[PDB]
Subunit: 307 residues, 2 copies
């Protein structure tokens, strides 16, 4: 059962991750693309989503890969036009817009899928199963990378709604909220904001789950001595250590063998299954935690980043 | 009679909560907790922990302190088996309110996130008039001198204290009650004095799910005019709420209202929720403010002076 698919926003994530994953998934037929960049070979091309929707009435689904600040208008137009919708993360620039999109999709009988690619990393499900029945003592997240190495020349990240360092940091939060059994409350946050941008370049979160387990997180996009994408969960049965952003796992000091990394193949497989079953999948809890940090966090100005 | 403790005895507690409680025979004011002066005629405590330990029979608590301490207080009260009424905003974050609601539901206790402005007398007549009408646009103007209306307050300037969204969320609580469809924030601008953490002025550009534009201007700076107005343009004329919800006109004609009794109405509703075994936790006004802090552009302005 082939689902015809359009991709909206042909940036580097689309070309590097989405198009290769789609082209390797038999359940989808890549039919159309929309962007203002180079024409994509082998599909029908459009420069905006309005033109794509007007010319592709039979199209089944769209996958949205553009920056989050345009996500609501695009997803709304796609749902109004009768298409199933897959969202890159974060699923919106605000929480209200995601709630409205979910309600609209449910009313129209269409699949809406808020994706979290890091939740499909190979360590996540083994970690979730190991932690389900165990006494958890503390969680530490360290998510540090040089923005100039990992997001060279990107500007939407610095604009209102662009998350700054919570762009990678929400990936860590999407893993934490999937592997931990209880919900998190933000007790304190500090956001470090360069004077020439609108979003933080570094942040610290102090959270607690509903049993009082301390959950601390450090996100940093400044140049530093180490790049690391680590989540450590201390338990009465030893430390569970996720590293390499979810691609590496050790439990009580022992490495755990994992399946190969296939985050975006797993996302598209799940999108196809959601469509097939008439279901949606919209978990906004990672975005709610980020919203709480922007609402409750203390802001500290720092020197200009240089854009 | 529901035995009631009040937590946080500042001037809103002294001027609004206690008079409303004392005039409502459905409650018996039993205990107060505050680090400030003792309250006369009740048992007094310096903190909620001591109150809970000494008042095991107590039925309910009403939390009136700043929102930055409300989660720890409400959680302790729910863990102690008390029904809980929250001043607005119901938390400093959305996650804490979701956790409190789930805890209350698991324990079989009433949790009530109050919005005093939703009980202003214009609100229900405005909601009923707008329910079946074609709306074209909404304008909110909520402007007051902070030094007049919140003199000497500091929590408003600290992280989680909302700044001008302290009164502004009252306007949003009215708008989200009178309008039939949900709102999406499209743009916000927050003006933040260099010596505080929260905005002193803000503009919001929203749209409802039919595309109706909903614009709001909030300002705490000294200005020529103080105003607390919501105007809804419709195919059948303008609905105009003024005086914070204490005055209403529809299509150019004044509308008779009942007495302005926001806090009496809140406590009556809390009593009814307890009696019916229900909770009432609408966080949509806070979600809109969260969206403004997450998506809004921030502009520094001159120091406020505190």
């Amino acid at each position: 059962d082939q689902v015809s698919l359009g991709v909206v926003g042909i940036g580097k994530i689309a070309r590097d991750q989405h198009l290769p994953a789609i082209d390797a998934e038999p359940g989808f037929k890549l039919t159309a693309c929309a962007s203002r960049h180079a024409e994509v070979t082998g599909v029908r091309n459009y420069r905006d989503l309005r033109a794509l929707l007007a010319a592709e009435r039979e199209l089944d689904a769209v996958s949205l890969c553009a920056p989050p600040q345009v996500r609501y208008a695009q997803a709304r137009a796609a749902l109004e036009a009768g298409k199933h919708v897959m969202l890159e993360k974060p699923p919106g620039a605000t929480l209200g817009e995601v709630a409205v999109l979910e309600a609209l999709a449910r009313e129209r009988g269409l699949t809406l899928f808020a994706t979290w690619h890091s939740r499909c990393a190979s360590a996540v499900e083994p970690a979730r199963e190991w932690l389900a029945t165990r006494a958890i003592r503390a969680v530490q997240v360290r998510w540090k990378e040089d923005v100039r190495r990992w997001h060279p020349g990107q500007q939407w990240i610095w604009e209102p709604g662009g998350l700054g360092v919570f762009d990678p940091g929400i990936n860590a939060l999407s893993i934490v909220t999937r592997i931990l059994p209880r919900e998190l409350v933000l007790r304190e946050a500090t956001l470090i904001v360069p004077s020439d941008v609108q979003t933080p370049i570094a942040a610290e979160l102090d959270c607690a789950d509903t049993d009082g387990v301390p959950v601390r997180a450090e996100f940093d996009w400044r140049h530093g001595p180490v790049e690391q994408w680590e989540i450590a969960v201390d338990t009465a049965d030893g430390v569970l250590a996720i590293s390499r952003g979810g691609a590496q796992l050790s439990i009580a000091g022992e490495p755990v063998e994992l399946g190969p990394e296939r985050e975006y193949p797993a996302l598209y497989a799940h999108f196809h299954a959601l469509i097939a079953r008439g279901e949606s999948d919209v978990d906004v809890r990672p975005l709610r935690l980020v919203a709480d940090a922007f609402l409750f966090g203390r802001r500290v100005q720092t020197d200009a980043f240089g854009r």
